[PDB]
Amino acid sequence: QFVKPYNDDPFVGNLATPVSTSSFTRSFLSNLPAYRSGLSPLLRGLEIGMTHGYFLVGPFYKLGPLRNSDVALISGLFSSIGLIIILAACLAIYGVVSFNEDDNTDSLQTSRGWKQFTSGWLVGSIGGASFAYILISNIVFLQTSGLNLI
């Protein structure tokens, strides 16, 4: 009843399941930036990088080598920036290798589309890391994970 063939195609290597083809799943996936409609590859990259560079600062800030120092947050931001640069390089090389120069009109599966996506991802990631750095440096609750209220 709940599990069925994918797209009514019994011989495709997939099954239609609640996790895979439910209404909530479809809405969530179709509203994520990687799939939302109307966004340019640049805007997709911007949103995704913003979201990712934010979470990156914390692990580095609170568990890095200079975590028990007075420069822990700056060190964390710096290490996030380095990782963001490495991942932007990965994105760029993947784009140049995978996508040939034929023009499919910026569909995120084109050379131009992926270039825009990686540029937006770099900008948004650096911006999000900086925003997280500002918020952590200025709010005590984030520097102590709530152990200021104790």
Residues that bind ligand 8CT (CB under 6 A): 50-51, 54-55, 123-124, 127-128, 130-131
71 binds, among ligand 8CT, other proteins, none (CB under 5 to 8 A by kind): none
Q: Least CB distance from residue 32 to other proteins, whole Å? A: 7
Window 41-60: residues binding other proteins (CB under 8 A) = none
Query: b or e along 3-24 (b: 16 or more beta carbons within 10 Å of the residue's beta carbon)?
Result: eeeeeeeeeeeeebeeeebeee
Lookup: tokens for 65? 């080598």
Lookup: tokens for 129? 């890391």
Environment class of 118 (CB within 10 Å of its CB; exposed 0-12, middle 13-18, buried 19+): buried
Q: Least CB distance from residue 11 to ligand 8CT, whole Å? A: 33
Q: Least CB distance from residue 109 to other proteins, whole Å? A: 8
